[PDB]
Design an enzyme around this catalytic site. Structure first.
Site, PDB file in Angstrom:
ATOM      1  N   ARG A  57       0.829  -1.200   0.000  1.00 29.35           N
ATOM      2  CA  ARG A  57       0.000   0.000   0.000  1.00 29.35           C
ATOM      3  C   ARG A  57       0.864   1.251   0.000  1.00 29.35           C
ATOM      4  O   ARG A  57       1.795   1.372   0.800  1.00 29.35           O
ATOM      5  CB  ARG A  57      -0.888   0.005   1.230  1.00 29.35           C
ATOM      6  CG  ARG A  57      -1.938   1.093   1.246  1.00 29.35           C
ATOM      7  CD  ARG A  57      -3.173   0.632   0.510  1.00 29.35           C
ATOM      8  NE  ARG A  57      -4.357   1.407   0.869  1.00 29.35           N
ATOM      9  CZ  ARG A  57      -4.876   1.455   2.093  1.00 29.35           C
ATOM     10  NH1 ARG A  57      -4.313   0.769   3.085  1.00 29.35           N
ATOM     11  NH2 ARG A  57      -5.963   2.184   2.322  1.00 29.35           N
ATOM     12  N   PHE A  62       1.207  10.512   2.786  1.00 30.32           N
ATOM     13  CA  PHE A  62       0.629  10.036   4.020  1.00 30.32           C
ATOM     14  C   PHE A  62       1.542   8.944   4.576  1.00 30.32           C
ATOM     15  O   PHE A  62       2.130   9.091   5.653  1.00 30.32           O
ATOM     16  CB  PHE A  62      -0.781   9.510   3.751  1.00 30.32           C
ATOM     17  CG  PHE A  62      -1.440   8.897   4.948  1.00 30.32           C
ATOM     18  CD1 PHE A  62      -1.353   9.496   6.198  1.00 30.32           C
ATOM     19  CD2 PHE A  62      -2.206   7.743   4.812  1.00 30.32           C
ATOM     20  CE1 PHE A  62      -2.020   8.957   7.297  1.00 30.32           C
ATOM     21  CE2 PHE A  62      -2.880   7.193   5.905  1.00 30.32           C
ATOM     22  CZ  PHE A  62      -2.787   7.805   7.150  1.00 30.32           C
ATOM     23  N   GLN A  65       3.022   1.222   3.266  1.00 31.85           N
ATOM     24  CA  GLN A  65       2.813   0.078   4.146  1.00 31.85           C
ATOM     25  C   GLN A  65       3.425  -1.209   3.605  1.00 31.85           C
ATOM     26  O   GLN A  65       3.555  -1.387   2.394  1.00 31.85           O
ATOM     27  CB  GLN A  65       1.310  -0.102   4.331  1.00 31.85           C
ATOM     28  CG  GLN A  65       0.881  -0.926   5.503  1.00 31.85           C
ATOM     29  CD  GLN A  65      -0.623  -0.921   5.642  1.00 31.85           C
ATOM     30  OE1 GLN A  65      -1.254   0.137   5.624  1.00 31.85           O
ATOM     31  NE2 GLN A  65      -1.211  -2.101   5.775  1.00 31.85           N
ATOM     32  N   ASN A 103      -2.559  -2.021  12.338  1.00 35.11           N
ATOM     33  CA  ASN A 103      -3.459  -2.913  13.061  1.00 35.11           C
ATOM     34  C   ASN A 103      -4.915  -2.789  12.616  1.00 35.11           C
ATOM     35  O   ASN A 103      -5.257  -1.958  11.774  1.00 35.11           O
ATOM     36  CB  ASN A 103      -3.329  -2.679  14.575  1.00 35.11           C
ATOM     37  CG  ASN A 103      -3.818  -1.312  15.010  1.00 35.11           C
ATOM     38  OD1 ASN A 103      -3.262  -0.709  15.929  1.00 35.11           O
ATOM     39  ND2 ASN A 103      -4.875  -0.824  14.373  1.00 35.11           N
ATOM     40  N   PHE A 114       4.059   0.521   8.856  1.00 36.85           N
ATOM     41  CA  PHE A 114       4.042   1.576   7.863  1.00 36.85           C
ATOM     42  C   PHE A 114       5.037   2.650   8.252  1.00 36.85           C
ATOM     43  O   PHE A 114       5.483   2.722   9.396  1.00 36.85           O
ATOM     44  CB  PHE A 114       2.641   2.167   7.655  1.00 36.85           C
ATOM     45  CG  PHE A 114       1.993   2.688   8.898  1.00 36.85           C
ATOM     46  CD1 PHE A 114       1.378   1.822   9.793  1.00 36.85           C
ATOM     47  CD2 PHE A 114       1.969   4.055   9.162  1.00 36.85           C
ATOM     48  CE1 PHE A 114       0.747   2.310  10.943  1.00 36.85           C
ATOM     49  CE2 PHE A 114       1.341   4.558  10.310  1.00 36.85           C
ATOM     50  CZ  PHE A 114       0.726   3.683  11.200  1.00 36.85           C
ATOM     51  N   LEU A 123      -3.403   9.381  14.134  1.00 39.07           N
ATOM     52  CA  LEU A 123      -3.039   7.997  14.407  1.00 39.07           C
ATOM     53  C   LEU A 123      -2.504   7.843  15.827  1.00 39.07           C
ATOM     54  O   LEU A 123      -2.425   6.730  16.349  1.00 39.07           O
ATOM     55  CB  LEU A 123      -1.988   7.510  13.409  1.00 39.07           C
ATOM     56  CG  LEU A 123      -2.377   7.526  11.928  1.00 39.07           C
ATOM     57  CD1 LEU A 123      -1.232   6.995  11.086  1.00 39.07           C
ATOM     58  CD2 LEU A 123      -3.611   6.670  11.714  1.00 39.07           C
ATOM     59  N   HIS A 127      -1.795   3.487  17.354  1.00 41.07           N
ATOM     60  CA  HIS A 127      -0.732   2.723  16.712  1.00 41.07           C
ATOM     61  C   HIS A 127       0.564   2.856  17.480  1.00 41.07           C
ATOM     62  O   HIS A 127       0.941   3.956  17.887  1.00 41.07           O
ATOM     63  CB  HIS A 127      -0.523   3.219  15.289  1.00 41.07           C
ATOM     64  CG  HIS A 127      -1.700   2.981  14.402  1.00 41.07           C
ATOM     65  ND1 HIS A 127      -1.838   1.839  13.645  1.00 41.07           N
ATOM     66  CD2 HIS A 127      -2.819   3.708  14.200  1.00 41.07           C
ATOM     67  CE1 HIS A 127      -2.997   1.872  13.015  1.00 41.07           C
ATOM     68  NE2 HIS A 127      -3.613   2.994  13.333  1.00 41.07           N
TER      69      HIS A 127
END
Length: 166
Positions: A57, A62, A65, A103, A114, A123, A127
């Site tokens: 990803r 941003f 991943q 997660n 990531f 976030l 995380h």
């Protein structure tokens, strides 16, 4: 940033072309369990790990991943402790170049992670942040500049052809 206690690397290449090395510093005192799981998945001292996995990803500006070495689609992965392990420390917040644990809700840490390429405060608290890209951030910017299809999946495979501890 928290105290760096260990360093590991990723040798990346977007198919028949080498992109370079990403050096990562781990926060061993703030997240011992999380950093060791990552460290060992990097060295592959268990017969499985990040070697040959991909960054499935990529979200321009941003984060990127990866870490799904079982299904390569963003549904698999596994820790050295088992299927999933609990959130060890949720007090460390995100910053550009942060290595964070991906997660699917509280306490679902596996092997997926990531790397943020911009501040992501939304976030914070959900995380586990356990690392920082100490070197090779330009490699990371190149990865987030690759063409992606649906679900933000790279058209060409961004593969970690090698990894280990320094």
């Amino acid at each position: 940033e928290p105290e760096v206690t260990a360093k590991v690397y990723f040798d990346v290449m977007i198919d028949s072309e080498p992109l370079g090395r990403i050096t990562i510093g781990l926060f061993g005192k703030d997240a011992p369990l999380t950093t060791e799981n990552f460290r060992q998945l990097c060295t592959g001292e268990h017969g499985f790990g990040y070697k040959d996995s991909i960054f499935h990803r990529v979200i321009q500006n941003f984060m990127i991943q990866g870490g799904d070495f079982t299904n390569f689609d963003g549904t698999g992965g596994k820790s050295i402790y088992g299927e999933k392990f609990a959130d060890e420390n949720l007090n460390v917040k995100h910053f550009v170049g942060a290595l964070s644990m991906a997660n699917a809700g509280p306490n679902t840490n596996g092997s997926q992670f990531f790397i943020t390429t911009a501040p992501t405060p939304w976030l914070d608290g959900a995380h586990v942040v356990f690392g920082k890209v100490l070197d090779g951030m330009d490699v990371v910017l190149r990865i987030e500049k690759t063409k992606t299809n649906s679900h933000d999946r790279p058209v060409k495979p961004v593969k970690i052809v090698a990894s280990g501890e320094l």
